[model samples]
Target: MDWYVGTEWEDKNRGLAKKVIGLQFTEMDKPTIISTVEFSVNKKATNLGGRPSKYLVSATYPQKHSLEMGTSLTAVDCYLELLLQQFVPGETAACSITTKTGERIEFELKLEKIV
Candidate 1:
């Protein structure tokens, strides 16, 4: 369970850095086989308030894997459920990547909230 945090300029590509991070999990294990990956954007804290554009959230993983076997989706779902139940809406939800080694890494937009 390692954590990484960083910021990206709107002009630069965000997916590029995420791809590099994904490449870090090169080895496959029991945890990796049943892992999941997800991506999301924060709208409230994001500086895109005055911009006319769309944000991109992309995730890449090793082929032939199903998220149904992992807790990533369930965790995100539970998070959203709790948020909805509490009605504590804010920025965006946390984007997570579950490695083949069962390592769940969460990447959040620097200025956004993890709702």
Candidate 2:
């Protein structure tokens, strides 16, 4: 499983980029699965807005993390931490973050295995 997250340009670009990105899983027993998230991001665009784009982060394990993968903020300024909750494997995870300027970043995750 590859936890790959990439960007897409939408009428704009940048915010769609992941300044700080990673994953953590509730399955501590599954050492081979998503279990920890390491991330942070300094801001580039104002209010984390203006940069319009999308990130397709798929999979559940072995995420490729790189400071180069992020945009403006990179990894030296912003602060990101987890909410401390268990992630349900069979359940779909979804959330939305909107900038004051009405720029929205939304994503969903589902676990599917190929037999």
Candidate 3:
């Protein structure tokens, strides 16, 4: 998936000339997958109206009783961490996954602001 950032522009006389600007995303095979997708926001980010200058992510996984794929789990986790570091700054984030074998995998992500 790709993340995008942009501003809207308009001229009273010209009408509309919307242009998309910044767009980015982590490479695939990163985000971790589990039975249930969970997300956490850093305490410092609470004031940003839960809106970082980047993309918001949400994911879904199979049920706990179903076999879990390690590759899928690792992929999502990696992507999340990569994105956080590239985007959010001086913040921390995390996620977890529950497998059918009753095993849980957790991942932690750190982010720093880019100037």
TM-score of each: 0.18, 0.26, 0.23
Highest lDDT model number: 3
Model 2 TM-score, all chains together: 0.26
What clash count goes with each model? 1, 2, 17
RMSD of 3: 14.7
Give the higher-TM-score candidate: 1 or 2.
2
- Candidate 3 to truth, TM: 0.23
Cα shift from native, residue 16, model 1 (Å):
48
State each model's CA lDDT, in order.
0.31, 0.31, 0.37
- Collision pairs in model 1: 32-100
lDDT of predicted model 2? 0.31
Residues 1-115 of candidate 1: C-alpha lDDT, one tens digit per residue: 2333343334355544332233232233112323332323432222222322122222342111112222433444444322222211222334544545675544342211111
Model 1: CA > 4 A from native:
1-40, 43-75, 83-87, 91-102, 107-115
Can you write out model 3's per-residue Cα lDDT over 2-57, one digit (the tens) per residue? 22346667776977587678644553323333322223433222222332222223
